[PDB]
TrEMBL record:
Gene field: Hnrnpl
Top-level taxon: Eukaryota
Biased composition (Polar residues): 108-118
Taxonomic source organism: Rattus norvegicus (Rat)
Transmembrane segments: none
UniProt name for this protein: Heterogeneous nuclear ribonucleoprotein L
Residues of the full protein shown: 174 to 298 of 593
Amino acid sequence: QKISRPGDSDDSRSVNSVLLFTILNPIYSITTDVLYTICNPCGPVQRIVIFRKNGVQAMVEFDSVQSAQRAKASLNGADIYSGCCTLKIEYAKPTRLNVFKNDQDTWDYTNPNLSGQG
RNA sequence: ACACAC
């Protein structure tokens, strides 16, 4: 088991305020709204995106590392449906999106100019 | 199941 230490534990050498969201049971259409509904109480979300390239996944970005730490520690193993759409969460390696519009699979919670690009 | 989701 990993001992808690700075510069070694996941929470002290891999934190970039960005997280990856893996869906275990995509029996329903996942959207940026439901991901925001569970991520917003964990902190002020800034961006959300969804992709299907290798399965079913989503991404989230926070205004602070502290919001990403409690989101990754509370929403992990949680479910969107309260019976299905189970989650897994970990720190992401990229650090910024290049969002171009807002819709059910892509969104930006601070740039209003992408709302008309739908 | 790691953003570039058209």
